[PDB]
C-alpha cells in the first residue's frame, strides 16, 4: 500500500482549519481512507527587544511572538483523490507540502 503525507502549515488558525475541512470532505467524498488531521505542535517564535529608543528610561522590554500551526494528513493512495487536491483553493497564508510514503 501507499499513503500520502500532507503537511498543511499556516499562521492563521481559521484558514488552516478550512483547508483541513476541505481535505476531509474531499476524502470522504472520494471514498478513501484518510487518517484524520493530526495537528503537530504549534511553533511560537519569540523575539525580545527593549522599547526605549534612546539609552534612557528604566529597563523595559517586550516579547513579540509568531504562532504558526501545522497539520498532517495521511491519505491512502487514490489517484482520483490525488488529482482533486490540486484544485484546493490554498489561501495565501496556507502552504501545502505533499509527500508519498510506501
Amino acid at each position: 500500500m501507499q499513503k500520502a503525507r500532507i503537511k498543511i502549515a499556516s499562521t492563521n488558525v481559521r484558514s488552516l482549519d478550512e483547508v483541513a475541512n476541505q481535505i476531509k470532505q474531499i476524502a470522504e467524498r472520494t471514498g478513501v481512507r484518510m487518517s484524520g488531521p493530526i495537528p503537530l505542535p504549534t511553533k511560537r517564535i519569540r523575539i525580545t527587544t527593549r522599547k526605549s529608543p534612546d539609552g534612557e528610561g528604566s529597563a523595559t522590554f517586550d516579547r513579540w511572538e509568531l504562532r504558526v500551526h501545522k497539520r498532517l494528513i495521511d491519505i491512502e493512495a487514490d489517484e482520483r483523490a490525488m488529482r482533486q487536491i490540486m484544485r484546493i483553493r490554498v489561501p495565501e497564508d496556507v502552504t501545502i507540502e505533499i509527500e508519498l510514503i510506501s
Binding site: 528604566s58 529597563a59 523595559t60 522590554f61
Partner: protein, 128 residues
C-alpha cells in the same frame, strides 16, 4: 485500569492489574530508589489503603518530566487514582481526602512566567 497523574511537569501513566503485589517505577522496584524521601512519597498512598490491597494488585507506572521529587509525587498521584478506580471503595477515597486534599484532586499550580528587570533570578526579582 489506566490512571493519570499531573504535577508541575511530571506526567505519570499508571496501569493497575491483579498481581502478587509487585509495583515498579519505570521498571524499577519501589524499595530500591536511592533518594529516601522520594521513596517515602511513593510509599505513602498505599500505606493507609491497607496491606491487603498492597499485596492484592500489581501496578506499573511510567513517569516523565519534573524532578525525582516531581516524578515521585506524580507516581503517588497515579497510584492514588488507581487504588480508588480499581477498588471503587468510597471509604478509601474519604480517608485519602482526610489525609490529604490533593491525592485525587491534585495541585494545578505551576511556575509563573519570568518578566523584564532581572528576569533570570525570577519573575519578581528587580534591581536594587
Amino acid at each position: 485500569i489506566q490512571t493519570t497523574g499531573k504535577r508541575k511537569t511530571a506526567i505519570a501513566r499508571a496501569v493497575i492489574r491483579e498481581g502478587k503485589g509487585r509495583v515498579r517505577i519505570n521498571g524499577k522496584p519501589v524499595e530500591i530508589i536511592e533518594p529516601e524521601i522520594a521513596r517515602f512519597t511513593i510509599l505513602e498512598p498505599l500505606i493507609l489503603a491497607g496491606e491487603e490491597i498492597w499485596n492484592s494488585v500489581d501496578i506499573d507506572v511510567k513517569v516523565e518530566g519534573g524532578g525525582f521529587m516531581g516524578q515521585a509525587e506524580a507516581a503517588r498521584m497515579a497510584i492514588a487514582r488507581a487504588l480508588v478506580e480499581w477498588t471503587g471503595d468510597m471509604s478509601l477515597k474519604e480517608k485519602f481526602m482526610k489525609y490529604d486534599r490533593t491525592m485525587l484532586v491534585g495541585d494545578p499550580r505551576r511556575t509563573e512566567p519570568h518578566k523584564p528587570n532581572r528576569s533570570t533570578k525570577g519573575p519578581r526579582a528587580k534591581r536594587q
